[model samples]
Target: PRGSALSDTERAQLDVMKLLNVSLHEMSRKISRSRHCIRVYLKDPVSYGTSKRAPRRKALSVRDERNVIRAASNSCKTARDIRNELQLSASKRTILNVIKRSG
Candidate 1:
């Protein structure tokens, strides 16, 4: 994959992805990029420029997340209770993660 060089666009994209701290697999798997190509791009910016990854959007909005916490403040509430009270479509895993993070 590192056979050639990247263009200007490619180099900037790679730097942004680095800034985001995304994994090499994400860079490669999602796009035509390979890590070695990125390294070589860094080495030879003018010769070849490159590409990036993510922190995904939260499943719930800040307000919805707050509502989930408030409605479940009793800890007596189950995930289902929070979902029903808040009318949220979030998965059980997502709900659990929110609750776990809070306490």
Candidate 2:
């Protein structure tokens, strides 16, 4: 079922329908798309009116980065100690990454 989607011009026209004082049914007929398409875009113009790819989530979040760096600063501490001291269930590789990076 995956295929092409609406273009920016089509999306913008749908967005401008409100400013142009046009109704969904009217715009749909003029654009040759369905009323449902116009309605969906109108409900969330910021998302639909723009073209973009979603950004990837970070491997390390704020809390983990700080704690991991803090734990890494002390070379005597083992990975198990860091894991337990931080009360985190982070993977051994994650702990090692912080230790190596801070080293």
Candidate 3:
């Protein structure tokens, strides 16, 4: 099929597959689907999963906002330092965004 509908579990699996860098054959074996099916799913991901909905908001929680401020205030000198101290997994851009928002 060109685009088989995907279940929510399949969509979540797709995310994991992408992160793990699984090959088509590997994904097919894991998902019990044919390689061709996997290919079709990848090509038309929008057809699978729930309705194409955008997030409602981008606001952070009060604690997260406070954390952002704290991270920005700490002169860690590097993203790695801030990440370790804040226990956050983020890049320099994330830190910069937090600082920009807090400021």
Candidate 4:
């Protein structure tokens, strides 16, 4: 089946119509698109235009990774100490990987 992706001109038209404070129903009629479609687009046009699938998540979040890096940077803390302190499910090797990657 064909995708429902909008053309560049259609996106620009939607922007102009929205800027003019066009009613949802009117916008839908003008664009020959569903009101829901217009609403979703207007809500987050940038994200809507980006068709790429979401990237796979990492084992550690940004903050969690930062914590791992910061703790590892100190000579006083061992990998096991950092892991226990953070209560992370990842292995000591994972913690070491973050430190090695950061450096």
Best by TM-score: 1
Query: Which of 2 and 4 is the better model by TM-score?
Result: 4
Each prediction's RMSD over C-alphas, in Å, is: 11.8, 6.6, 13.5, 7.8
TM-score of 3: 0.38
Q: Estimate, for each residue in 51-91, the C-alpha lDDT of model 2 and write its tens digit.
A: 66789875667788788877677567888788888777777
Model 1 agreement with the true structure over 1-103: per-residue lDDT tens digits? 4355555566677778778887777765544777676666555565552243458899999998888787777568789878877879989778889988898
Ranking by TM-score: 1, 4, 2, 3
Q: Which wins on lDDT, candidate 2 or candidate 4?
A: 4
Candidate 4, 12-32: lDDT as tens digits: 999999999999999989989
Q: Candidate 1: deviation at residue 89, Å?
A: 0.5
User: Poorest 10 consecutive residues of model 1 by lDDT?
Assistant: 45-54
Alpha-carbon runs more than 4 Å astray in model 1? 1-39, 42-52
Off by over 4 Å in 2: 1-3, 49-103
Q: Ten consecutive residues with minimal summed lDDT in candidate 3? A: 56-65
lDDT of 2 at 34: 77
What is the TM-score (0 to 1) of candidate 1?
0.50
Ranking the candidates on lDDT from highest down gives 4, 2, 1, 3
Per-candidate Cα lDDT values, in order, are 0.73, 0.76, 0.69, 0.85
Q: Tell me the deviation in Å of residue 79 in model 2.
A: 36
